[PDB]
């Protein structure tokens, strides 16, 4: 039995009946009081902490209010069935100390227990919370642990935290992409609906890939976070400088080839100079094929009488592949 | 143990056993009685706080009551598991008193602990409830703090309160946006549907832009509410002399240049004299485009029978940008 | 502690243990006993009421049984989690008295707080329970009080409860409208759907207008309570004679003129001789433009072939204004 | 305190804690133990019943087992959350008895206190449960009380219980329809959804209509439960001898006049002989017009090259009245 | 207080301090001991019953347990709410034991008390569970009681228990089928959806017919389960040797006549030798016509250029039915 | 009453109040104390097991830390409702030991009562969790045990665990199949919507299929997982040399002899050398008719104008199998 000050901002959810002081997750303390100090509404708090805390308890301990994850009943309003809330510690070397000041945020990932902590990085968070999880062939082997802006606002930076046995799933070569919320396509000539699983729909998902060769990813290795399946394809970047954007779509375009989809028109922009220039990314066993004097050229929708097909006419432009000969080139003009 | 006497209008949530009297969060007081007043249907509720309050207790001291928010729950009707009320209190200088007189509601936001606390002018109230949260980059960086009608009955004002780290994010030249509620689209050539968040479909949501050099917002600043995304996106008002609005949407309408989407009509109005007039918002990049003898005009729908497109004609009227040179001009006239 | 009789026809919901006799929602009394009488199912109820109470008990004093709102909970079957009942009372002068006969339903609203109690009539109850909401710019100021059919049985007259500091909004020619369940259209050339609030799905809502320049309404002024935002709007009628209503539609014909919707087709009747005649409300706007030599006539949705436009044939027969100078006339003939 | 036997076929939800023996929602019994005998399945239970009730208690006394009402949690499975059973009594007349056989269903409507008790008569019973509810202008004006097969086996009757002061409502020529599930419905040239209310979607629900000057029903007055409010519009019905059934529907096909709806297809039979006739109702005001040389002939959906419409070609087969003079006559010949 | 050991497989949800041994609904014995034998799993449950059940306790005495319906609240996961387990006995002459060995399952239903035991083939289970419900005239007239897989592997065979009273509902000649989940219909020329009850979707249903004259089923009498009411018609199957299934449907092709909807293509074969035949339900109102030269023979989706009908487009292939004169024959020649 | 210390790496939902130790569901341990060592996150739970117990404990005894399953309520968020966490044991051989170390997951399936522990290899795990059940004529016989990666990382490996008296069902030519989530089909001229069970829709579910003769299966037997009805259906792959898949769809691609469906393209590839080939599943019946100058050509929708059929070009490209006689062959070139 002690007695420990903390000073918070906002007194919710704390009271002195059950509120533990959960050390990696082990009921340590017990809040006993909660008194107010007027000035910049300052709260203070007093615990009890056991013994030998109380003697590993020091200058450099963080302390900081956790409330429950962002949930469905939370969001309903069922206040009465969602959970309680704790307080956290983190024991530094320091010095002696009674007196602390809260913390507004959980703490950096400092413990080593073999867990793979590696850094994401999106242009917005999504519907990602915290506490949402991460999948390999839909298997759960991880949980996104924090996100933060970086220092530059344009992006946000989500760190997970991929378990121990599981660390040998993510390489350098792993791409992650985004798998959160329901999407429902209508398509031509039917329609079928099956988009993603249960628990993503609620509080979202990341899911990954492994690649085959590629040295195991460690220590805080960076990672872009596609926002979806098909952004996250492998295939060769092919520039292509178009007459216009007429029948052009930024990501449902494709190119035929055989007949077949081959690769899909990913990028389309207006340069200055008024140059409406894009970009396509193509399958690897077609990447042989693209060569000097390989042209790619659009296709209209044009009306067909002798065979009658709606398919032609409800897709729009096709960009049509035609091989040919010579040293590889990457870059192609569209007339 | 004091005695405190607070009429109210109605003795509604209100039990002897457990009401408790939170003053920033914290439970100093305890309903004791309630007792009628027959003159004006005054309730008299004996409330005993604690002592040191007691001696903070002044002539100018604000108690009101506090329900729940509006939840899911709550319109459901499952009124055993939402929560319980409460009454609030906000000491001022004064003089001695024991008996005070309810407030309506919430009082004004007075502290000062570092949260911003800036002001959104919206032309009603939309989805958004007390207690609903604002978004940057799908991260919640504050909540709706209070709303109220302006003097003038044309608006709403909604103020909120962006928290303390956070308040280097907005600007001077933020725009806020709302994004509340559910909504779907059936579009051509295939439908898709990713509208919104989970908790801003329940309860509402404000997000917010953060642009790269403007000074930083302070103080009870001022802000424009757009309903919409597209509603806020930046760009140059162009003013147009249109001869009918026979085939022309107040939003749907589109600016082509070189066959991609450049500007949006934003306004359609019917002048008195029978001179429809409206307005178009285009992007920057083209801005440097408009000037003299640049001519903006639309384009029929008109039925193509070599090459077959459904967009074409599913799509309508469409401005044409055909640029020019000379002194940048910013109003139009469509023949 | 004392004995008050009160006759009930259905002990439901009526536990001796806990059953509070709030009288403004102020619990003054309990229920001690049921007794049966075995006369046209009388039911004796003893409760136990205060002793201020008591000597303030007298021969008219109202007592009657409340069971919750209608709720989402209460349909679901969830007997559980809803809520308790109580029984009401309003003393009145009277006589001594001992034994009460209760009421069948609430009484009307007598009390004088500030609260403004005004009168709609409706030609049905439509989605409204008791307890649904009234809005002012989508902000909650006020509620429905009560409902009841008038001695015509044409209508219902549903009477609200307008708060004590929005009573200046509501005016002499205030229009209220309703808000309530949801409706999801399709629309040619896409579809959005955005319809109403989300408490107002499960309860339902009263919207309302307030005008520039009307007096304040007061003291149980009666209201039309249209069913729809755009059964409200404001405008001149306008009585035309119509060949035929071939294409015509109720609400679904516009008024072009310059091609935009300036008014709307508001009636379609089969008078007798077989004369089909409508009226149309205009906007504000072109009412200066309705005159002595301006003629009202519809265009059929004719096949166009030089401008392909699918709009044209989907909405179908489109009353045109052609202006014309003279005196304003108000109803007008179609050829 | 006293012992009394009462036999049943399954001890289901009877347990000798808490069940009561609520005779008119009065607590009188509790139920002591269960026993059982071998033969046949009886099962013996033993119930303590208070004093007056046991001098009231004779051989002519109903017993039968309430289970709570087919409910959203009672399908889901939340047996928690449902409620608890209880058993019911109705004393009668009859001799000294001690032991009671239990009843199979609940006992007719006996008691009279003003409540109005009528017969309904329909095909099947619908979406409709016991405790569904009755509306008037969707006022909730009575409930359902119980159904059973009729002795031959076509039909369900329902008989409802419209409240004491509701009871001038129900008329003679009323007409009771069906107000229950959820129809959505694509119609052409957009689409519009609002088919009922919230509490009528889990339960079901029976409104009706009081005509002008009819007299009042009384006493176990038997009426039709129409499926559909436009199955219950008023009319005269007009026998019609078609040539044949080739593109008229059973509901769907319309009467014109001057291009407005007036009557409606409502059955269409193939009498042998192969003679296909049918029959329509027919809007009182237009009845006036229907004499001899009075024609009503169908008008095919024709191709319109100078008008193109949509509405034409989609609805299809369309029945026209073309009026004449002479006596008034009630069958017509389609050629 | 006795004791009584029984082996069970698996324990779970059997508690020491409540799990009851429900003999026929009542509670006869409590669980007093879980210990475990190490040899094939064995689980020794030590059981106290009462005195009198004792001497009736034998040898050839059934225990099982059982586990609450498969629910909705068991599906999501909610095991607070749901219930608890117990185990069910079923004594027999036997001799005196101790030792008991569980079953895996519910034993046959051996006892009478009048209620009907029936049995239904069905080639799967379908939505239908233990407990799920049987209907007639859209009214509970009994329950599923059991299912098992018949010796030969290609069926279900389903037993079902009606109740006492409505045992002369069921006949030889009743036809059952099925009502189960939700099919939601788009129908051309608009479209409207009900299509069952609201129990029948969350756990499943059995509706069945009565027909007028027949002799009343009994004692475990087999029926067919259909799976649908329109396959459930009765009718006359004719036998049709079709020339091609180009553009006929297994259930979609109806047989004309006069234009009426008169039978329905029901099976579509190739037979060996490259034959397609099929056959078809006949309404019994026609079966008088179909005779020796009585031709059946299918129309195509002709277009249509003076009565212009999307309808007839629409449905395709359509079978006509010609009648003659002569002997009456049952299979036919299609052409 | 004894002491044995487990080691674990986060101490969440481990309450020293109530969490058992359940081995083989029984309630054999309690937890008495948690402690930490800092080294690692070492977590030291003391745990009090029973006195027979503690002899049978040995040094190689599994303890694991159990979770419940994965549901509707835990992604919700109600964690007051779902339930409560326990660790599970496996005593072996081993030697005397009081120091134990945690295992991260669920031991294999070590225990013989003759239930059938089978795997299956699926190319991901899909929507299935533990325990999900797996259908027989969807009849619930058996469930999801385990998942885990195999060694090669392509694959999962599902290892389900069907129940003592259903293992006769499988066989060796058995297919299991997946049916899990929803998917709704928009189809041409109409559409209809029955996809799945209520269970498999929240957990997942998997069916499969007894064939007629084959040799039962035992003992770890793998099996494919197939992830649809349609992808397990028996037949004889073809294989095609087609000229180009210009209209030719992955598994929409049918077969048609004497105007009926046969087979389904099943696979679709573009070789090197740009050879674009394919397979085909025919059924058994015409597996006869595959032959020497047997051939199978593509069929164009061509436009149909005396027979308007919108189905045929709906559909599109089509296979059509013309046979022939000689010797069987299962390769054919298509032109």
Same mark, same amino acid.
């Given at each position: 039995?002690?007695?420990?000050?903390?000073?918070?901002?906002?007194?919710?959810?704390?009271?002195?009946?059950?509120?533990?002081?959960?050390?990696?997750?082990?009921?340590?303390?017990?809040?006993?009081?909660?008194?107010?100090?007027?000035?910049?509404?300052?709260?203070?708090?007093?615990?009890?902490?056991?013994?030998?805390?109380?003697?590993?308890?020091?200058?450099?301990? *963080?302390? /900081?209010?956790?409330?429950?994850?962002?949930?469905?009943?939370?969001?309903?309003?069922?206040?009465?069935?969602?959970?309680?809330?704790?307080?956290?510690?983190?024991?530094?070397?320091?010095?002696?100390?009674?007196?602390?000041?809260?913390?507004?945020? *959980?703490?950096?990932?400092?413990?080593?227990?073999?867990?793979?902590?590696?850094?994401?990085?999106?242009?917005?968070?999504?519907?990602?919370?915290?506490?949402?999880?991460?999948?390999?062939?839909?298997?759960?082997?991880?949980?996104?642990?924090?996100?933060?802006?970086?220092?530059?606002?344009?992006?946000?930076?989500?760190?997970?935290?991929?378990?121990?046995?599981?660390?040998?799933?993510?390489?350098?070569?792993?791409?992650? /992409?985004?798998?959160?919320?329901?999407?429902?396509?209508?398509?031509?000539?039917?329609?079928?609906?099956?988009?993603?699983?249960?628990?993503?729909?609620?509080?979202?998902?990341?899911?990954?890939?492994?690649?085959?060769?590629?040295?195991?990813?460690?220590?805080?290795?960076?990672?872009?976070?596609?926002?979806?399946?098909?952004?996250?394809?492998?295939?060769?970047?092919?520039?292509?400088?178009?007459?216009?954007?007429?029948?052009?779509?930024?990501?449902?375009?494709?190119?035929?080839?055989?007949?077949?989809?081959?690769? *899909?028109?990913?990028?389309?922009?207006?340069?200055?100079?008024?140059?409406?220039?894009? %970009?396509?990314?193509?399958?690897?066993?077609?990447?042989?094929?693209?060569? %000097?004097?390989?042209?790619?050229?659009?296709?209209?929708?044009?009306?067909?009488?002798?065979?009658?097909?709606?398919?032609?006419?409800?897709?729009?432009?096709?960009?049509?592949?035609?091989?040919?000969?010579? %040293?590889?080139?990457?870059?192609?003009?569209?007339?």
């Amino acid at each position: 039995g002690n007695t420990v000050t903390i000073d918070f901002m906002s007194a919710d959810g704390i009271v002195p009946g059950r509120t533990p002081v959960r050390y990696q997750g082990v009921e340590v303390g017990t809040v006993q009081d909660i008194s107010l100090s007027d000035d910049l509404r300052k709260i203070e708090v007093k615990v009890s902490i056991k013994s030998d805390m109380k003697d590993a308890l020091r200058e450099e301990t *963080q302390f /900081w209010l956790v409330t429950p994850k962002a949930s469905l009943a939370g969001v309903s309003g069922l206040d009465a069935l969602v959970g309680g809330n704790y307080i956290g510690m983190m024991p530094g070397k320091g010095k002696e100390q009674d007196h602390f000041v809260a913390l507004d945020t *959980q703490p950096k990932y400092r413990l080593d227990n073999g867990d793979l902590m590696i850094h994401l990085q999106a242009p917005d968070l999504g519907s990602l919370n915290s506490g949402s999880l991460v999948y390999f062939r839909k298997i759960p082997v991880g949980k996104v642990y924090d996100y933060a802006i970086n220092p530059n606002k344009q992006g946000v930076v989500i760190d997970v935290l991929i378990e121990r046995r599981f660390t040998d799933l993510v390489k350098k070569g792993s791409r992650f /992409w985004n798998v959160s919320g329901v999407d429902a396509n209508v398509s031509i000539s039917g329609a079928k609906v099956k988009l993603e699983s249960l628990a993503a729909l609620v509080n979202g998902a990341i899911a990954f890939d492994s690649p085959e060769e590629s040295k195991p990813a460690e220590a805080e290795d960076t990672f872009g976070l596609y926002e979806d399946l098909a952004h996250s394809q492998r295939g060769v970047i092919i520039k292509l400088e178009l007459p216009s954007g007429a029948g052009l779509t930024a990501d449902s375009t494709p190119l035929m080839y055989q007949g077949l989809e081959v690769g *899909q028109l990913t990028k389309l922009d207006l340069n200055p100079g008024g140059k409406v220039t894009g %970009e396509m990314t193509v399958d690897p066993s077609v990447v042989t094929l693209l060569r %000097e004097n390989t042209r790619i050229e659009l296709r209209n929708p044009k009306l067909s009488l002798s065979d009658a097909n709606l398919s032609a006419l409800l897709t729009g432009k096709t960009f049509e592949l035609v091989p040919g000969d010579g %040293e590889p080139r990457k870059e192609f003009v569209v007339v």
